[PDB]
Structures are given as C-alpha cells and as structure tokens.
DNA sequence: ATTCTGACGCT
C-alpha cells in the first residue's frame, strides 16, 4: 500500500509532428495546403514509395509504404511532393533541418530527448514545479487547455465531448496540493499547449503531444487524438485504457517480443499482464523485459528523458533491389563514392554546427538472395572528412565478399555508410 | 521492388 511506488514522480511529454514531411512541403508550396497530398521517394518504380500522408489523404485510405500509383487508385486527386535527389539517391536534408527548427524551440522550455526526425520527449517535472509555485494556488482554467483531451473522460460533436471531459477533470482537481500528480500533469499540459503554440507560431508546423508520467504512456497518449491535439493520460486512467489496448500498441512490443507475450501467455491486451507475477514474466521474457513488463502494465516505467538533442550517428543508405543490384567493381566503387560524398557534406556541416567529430566508419552491405537485412557489417577508422578516403576505406573493408574470378558476386542489394563514435571538437 | 534512416540490446 503506502510503499508500492506508483511511478507518478515525473511529468513527461512526447511531442510528434503531424504528417511531418507533408507539412514541410506544404509550408514551402502553398498550393499543397489543406489538400490530399503525400511525400514520395523516387518516381520511376510505381510512382515512388510514399513515406508521409496528409490527413485529408488518409481519409481515402492512403498510407505510408504504399506505392504512389496505388495511392492514386484510392485518391485520384492526390497531390505528391518528391524528396530531393542528390548523387542518385534520396536526400532528406530539408526535413532534418526542419526538425532542428522544431527541436530548438522545444529546447527553450525544457531538456529534450530527440526520439526521431520529428519527435522528442520532454522532462517537464522542474518546469511544472516552477509554474505551480508561480501560480500560488490559482486554479487552472479550461481556457489554458484549448486543445487538450483527458483520456477516459467524460464519464458517467467531437469538440463538445472534448470540453465535457476537460470540465470533469478540472472540476475534480485539488489545486491547493502542490504535490498531487494529477495537478502536476495538468500544469504539464498547460506548458505543452504553450510549447505547441510556439512551434506553430515560429515554424508553421502543427503537432500533437502526449502528457503522462513516463515516456511510454506519453508516446501512447500522443497518438490518441492526432492531429493537432494533445492528450493527458493520468495514472488513474491506465486500468481502463489498458483493459482493451492491444499489446502491440505499446512502444517496444510491436514486434516479435510482443507476439511472444501474446502467444506464450495466451493474452491480447496490456492490462491482462497484471495477472502474472514479476518472476513469471522474467522467466518467459528475461529479467530486464520481465521487470519492465510487470511495471509497464501498471502504468509504471522509469526510462529517463535523456539530455540528447542531436543524433548519435550520421548515416547514408541506398537499396539496389531486384535487377538493379550492383554486379561490377566499378558500380560498387561509384556508389560508395556517392554515399561518401553525401556523408562528407553532412559531417562537415555537423562538425561546424555541433563542435564534434566522428571517429569510426561503419560499412554495411546486403547481398542478393541473402535473407538478412545486413549481409555484413564492418568498422574502420574515420580519421578525416574526405569522401574519397571514406569510400576507399569502405571498399577495402568489404572487398573480400566478392566471389568473382571486375565482376561482383553475389550482387549487392544495399550499401550503407554510417559515421559514429563522436568526440568533442 | 516501400526505402532511408537511427537507437538500443545481446553476446
Ligand atoms: N525515409 C523514410 N522516411 C520515413 C519513413 N517513415 C516515416 N518517415 C518520415 C516521414 C514522416 O513524415 C516522418 C515522421 O514519421 P511519423 O511521425 O511516424 N509520421 P508523420 O509525422 O508523417 O505522421 P503522424 O501525424 O502520423 O505522426 O518520418 C520511412 O520508412 N522512410
Ligand atoms: Mn509525426
Ligand atoms: Mn514520429
């Protein structure tokens, strides 16, 4: 009872941009705004592969991983923006720079952990404490939460439902107790409204957010009312929320591990995990995963918001599927050089912006007919930012995969160069 | 023949 800690010590938010690459293209090209539109990579094979879809286009069934030619069958009016092509490959620089715009705004409010090109976690515990002291017992008005949903409310038109649930929540709040976790989350949500307003004012981009006591619940909360809304998931909301939540929806369980939880335990929903002992879960899934699962299904997770805004690696990849696979020495060399030229550009800019240098070069390849996504992964020293040296070293390190007797066999279906092991500069 | 990333765990 009094000694079962409840994982209510922190206020954590997850901010995720709405259809991010589409919004970047819509800001640049006003003719795309408020239209069914998507962003593709390449164009020749089936019109290109879609990686981002506006919410208008999602209403017709357009999804990521769809070929644009197929999406047009669902949505004949679909508008398309193509990712930039440089040195014969997709170049995501525009979206990386847009990401930095957003991250720099979020960093004004609190320490953030970049979790992807378009999302960051925010540790708001200290900011909430400061703001609670600033309010000096003053209640929290619904006007301060104009885009917030309270998960699980109302209890007992979409905007009308939203506001009913918010009123129920706010009428229940104990504002005089500076230590109430529910009040702390509410103040967190006020700050996140301010952060999201700043992002939209200063970039034009809309985003959604989750506010809860840890990263997993904040990420889950984010997706519940996208787009352009934020969602507060309280500790008390967890039993009902998890009682029908498929296990695969929880971050890290969308893959083989979640499938094995489902199959070994004979369950479907996160909440059903509560019926197992910590030792039982550790027995099936290992000591780390088992402890994590035991706490997670009760709404509890301890993973910190890491102070890390910048990527830890800078990588350059290209697939060569089907008959396009690289089958000569000259081909492999030329593409390694293209990859290294983009890597050198991004690294030189990184070194000037972020006062750091990469020290290790990772080379990964796939060969045709190989089941694995990495037929080989080998590292070497990254001593200078020179594309010719990096491409020559990558070839030196992969060349003994060639079984030919000028030819390359098995043909390569993927090349990948990644700079890692950064040190201050 | 979604492709192009990037974090993190295991051994
Ligand atoms: N190259 C590449 N980029 C991708 C891929 N998947 C996503 N991206 C890029 C394009 C995406 O815009 C961006 C962020 O991915 P999300 O946050 O998962 N989706 P979004 O923000 O579009 O919509 P929502 O409102 O549902 O969050 O990452 C992929 O497989 N490949
Ligand atoms: Mn997003
Ligand atoms: Mn995202």
* Cα dihedral A346, A347, A353, A354 sign: positive
Residue whose CA lies nearest to ligand 1 atom number 29? A51
Contact in structure between A40 and A52 (CB atoms under 8 Å): no
- Separation in Å: B5 C1' and A193 CA: 30
Residue whose CA lies nearest to ligand 1 atom number 3? A51
Strand B nucleotides within 7 Å of a protein CB: 1-10
Contact in structure between A335 and A343 (CB atoms under 8 Å): no
| Resolved by | X-ray
Q: Which ligand is nearest to the CA of A65?
A: 1
Q: Which ligand is nearest to the CA of A53?
A: 1
Cα A366 from chain centroid (whole Å):
25
Question: Binding site annotation covers A119?
Answer: yes
Name the one residue in this structure whose structure tokens are 């995963």: A289
* Cα dihedral A132, A133, A138, A143 sign: negative
Per-residue flag: A246 CB under 7 A of strand B: no
Contact in structure between A57 and A75 (CB atoms under 8 Å): yes
Give the tokens for residue A37: 């539109």
Domains annotated for chain A, with CATH where assigned, are: 12-18+94-239 (3.30.70.270), 20-93 (3.40.1170.60), 314-424 (3.30.1490.100)
Give A285's contacts (C-beta < 8 A, 6+ positions apart).
Answer: A257, A260, A261, A293
């Amino acid at each position: 009872g009094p000694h079962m800690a409840t994982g209510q010590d922190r206020v954590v938010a997850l901010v995720d941009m709405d259809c991010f690459f589409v919004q970047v293209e819509q800001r640049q090209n006003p003719h795309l705004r408020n239209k069914p539109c998507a962003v593709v990579q390449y164009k020749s094979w089936k019109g290109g592969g879609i990686i981002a879809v506006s919410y208008e286009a999602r209403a017709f069934g357009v999804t990521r991983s769809m070929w644009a030619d197929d999406a047009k069958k669902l949505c004949p009016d679909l508008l398309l923006a193509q990712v930039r092509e440089s040195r014969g490959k997709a170049n995501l620089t525009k979206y990386r720079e847009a990401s930095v715009e957003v991250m720099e705004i979020m960093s004004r409010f609190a320490v953030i952990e970049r979790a992807s090109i378009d999302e960051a976690y925010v540790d708001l515990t200290s900011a909430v404490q400061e703001r609670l002291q600033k309010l000096q017992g003053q209640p929290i008005s619904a006007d301060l939460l104009p885009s917030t949903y309270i998960e699980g409310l109302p209890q007992g038109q979409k905007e009308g439902m939203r506001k009913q649930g918010l009123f129920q929540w706010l009428d229940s709040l104990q504002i005089d107790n500076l230590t109430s976790p529910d009040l702390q989350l509410t103040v967190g949500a006020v700050i996140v409204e301010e952060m999201r307003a700043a992002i939209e004012r200063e970039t034009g981009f809309q985003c959604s957010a989750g506010i809860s006591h840890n990263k997993v619940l904040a990420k889950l909360a984010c997706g519940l009312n996208k787009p352009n809304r934020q969602t507060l998931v309280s500790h008390g909301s967890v039993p009902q929320l998890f009682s029908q939540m498929p296990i695969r929806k929880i971050r890290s369980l969308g893959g083989k591990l979640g499938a094995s939880v489902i199959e070994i335990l004979g369950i479907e929903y996160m909440g059903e995990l509560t019926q197992f002992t910590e030792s039982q879960l550790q027995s099936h899934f290992g000591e780390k995963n088992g402890s994590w699962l035991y706490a997670m299904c009760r709404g509890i997770e301890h993973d910190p918001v890491k102070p890390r805004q910048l990527p830890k690696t800078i990588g350059c990849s290209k697939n060569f599927p089907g008959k396009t696979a690289l089958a000569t020495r000259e081909q492999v060399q030329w593409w390694l050089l293209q990859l290294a030229q983009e890597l050198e550009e991004r690294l030189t800019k990184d070194r000037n912006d972020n006062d750091r240098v990469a020290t290790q070069l990772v080379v990964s390849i796939r060969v045709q007919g190989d089941k694995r996504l990495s037929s080989l992964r080998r590292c070497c020293a990254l001593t200078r930012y020179d594309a010719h040296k990096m491409s020559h070293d990558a070839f030196t390190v992969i060349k003994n995969c060639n079984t030919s007797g000028t030819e390359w066999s098995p043909p390569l279906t993927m090349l990948f160069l990644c700079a890692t092991k950064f040190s201050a500069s």
